């Protein structure tokens, strides 16, 4: 779940400056007026867009060493392939 209370938000961009994944981004939009304050509480359904946003081509998972579907151990950037301790090479 991801919840942002825009009733308290001051739009400072400290959170966007803090991501190591360029996921959270403040976009050029200013029209968010509401009738009930409870509707100023946005969830992931009201936050997750369908594109990369201001940062066009950055994938933290291509830099991380943690294996995921698609990237196995040794398949990240600047990463060597796992060498078994039972290898015969000295």
């Amino acid at each position: 779940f991801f919840r942002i209370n825009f009733s308290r938000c001051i739009f400072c961009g400290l959170c966007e400056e803090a991501c190591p994944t360029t996921a959270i981004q403040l976009t050029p939009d200013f029209e968010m007026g509401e009738y009930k304050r409870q509707d100023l509480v946005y969830e992931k359904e009201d936050l997750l867009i369908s594109g990369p946003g201001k940062y066009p081509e950055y994938n933290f998972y291509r830099m991380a060493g943690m294996a995921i579907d698609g990237k196995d151990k040794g398949e990240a950037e600047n990463e060597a392939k796992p060498i078994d301790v039972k290898s015969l090479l000295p």
Partner: protein, 227 residues
């Protein structure tokens, strides 16, 4: 018991202790990894380096390991010596050469001794441009998770699991920079005290799976002293 001189200031410490233990107990901050208050001193990571002078007139001392050096009376040491600071930062840099970029997705973030020492040594710039070593992980049962990529080879786990808890299923395998710490084969750690590894390991190789399911950072936890 003994009088030592750290960075000019004089301190009264127990001569039976090592300079690391003594200075840490004085409130002085020296980076460390391989040493543990309960597992003793081994002198592996070479991180607790301090410059030691023979007397008060010595201006060209030597870099020694505070954990492997007695807090003897008449000891002149400097933690702020430039060479000591440079060497201590270099040790962290060498450990960062093959360290994975997985802070955001590791369960030790905000509770990691390695993160604390990197910052304490003031190492924020990378010069290494070559490849980082990788290791495949193992299944260690339903309580402890394995992520060998985040290892720094301090040997704390094997010294606690085997020399303190007397376990027989954890070990160090391989040689040189391909040293691996885990079980001889995939399976559940059999020690009834295997959980202490999560706090013993200074990195995120051993983590708590019971928490990983609903993981939250240390700063977001409400804690209370309980029995």
């Amino acid at each position: 018991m003994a009088t030592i001189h750290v960075d000019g200031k004089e301190y009264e410490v127990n001569g039976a202790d090592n300079l690391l233990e003594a200075c840490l107990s004085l409130g002085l901050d020296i980076p460390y990894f391989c040493w543990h208050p309960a597992l003793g001193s081994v002198g592996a990571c070479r991180q607790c380096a301090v410059k030691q002078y023979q007397n008060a007139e010595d201006t060209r001392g030597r870099l020694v390991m505070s954990c492997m050096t007695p807090a003897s009376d008449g000891t002149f040491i400097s933690i702020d010596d430039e060479e000591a600071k440079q060497f201590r930062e270099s040790v962290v840099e060498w450990l960062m050469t093959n360290h994975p970029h997985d802070c955001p997705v590791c369960e030790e973030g905000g509770n990691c001794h390695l993160q604390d020492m990197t910052v304490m040594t003031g190492h924020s710039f990378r010069r290494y441009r070559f490849t980082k070593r990788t290791h495949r992980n193992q299944d260690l049962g339903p309580f402890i998770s394995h992520e060998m990529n985040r290892c720094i080879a301090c040997y704390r786990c094997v010294r606690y699991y085997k020399d303190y808890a007397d376990g027989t299923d954890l070990g160090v395998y391989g040689a040189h920079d391909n040293v691996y710490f885990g079980r001889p084969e995939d399976g559940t750690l059999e020690s009834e005290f295997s959980g202490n590894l999560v706090e013993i390991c200074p990195t995120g190789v051993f983590t708590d799976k019971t928490h990983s399911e609903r993981y939250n950072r240390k700063w977001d936890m409400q804690f209370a002293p309980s029995i």
